[PDB]
Amino acid sequence: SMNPPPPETSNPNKPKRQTNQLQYLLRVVLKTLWKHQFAWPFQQPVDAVKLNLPDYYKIIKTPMDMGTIKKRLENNYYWNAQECIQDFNTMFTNCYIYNKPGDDIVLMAEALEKLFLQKINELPTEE
């Protein structure tokens, strides 16, 4: 089995918290990206077996995807907004590292990232 286990989406020992910033990240940021027409390749972990990408998990050692992020938010896995923002950045970065500049998947990622940055620019203050 050449896929690694997916990133954890819950952990009984990791402290849980709900902030208005994390609620914004689920209700506005994640929702906006999730339903976007280019979202689908990013909605679940990269299945390197089914996609026939043997070298993927030899190159990408910190995988991340929006399915994982969605579940983390729904499970109150994050303590703060920065943890979640970091996961989005990891997802985009992995795509830019593994794929060639100008590839369709890169253009899809760039479009989602632009939308992401717009919404993060409008992050609300802590209540």
Ligand SMILES: COc1nc2c(Nc3ccccc3C(C)(C)C)c(C(=O)O)cnc2cc1-c1c(C)noc1C
């Ligand atoms: C190439 O990047 C991906 N492609 C798919 C994918 N389809 C696919 C397969 C080969 C070539 C091109 C594609 C397109 C997405 C451009 C159509 C599928 C699928 O067909 O179900 C699923 N997950 C992916 C993740 C990725 C992906 C992401 C996201 N980041 O790196 C990779 C690699």
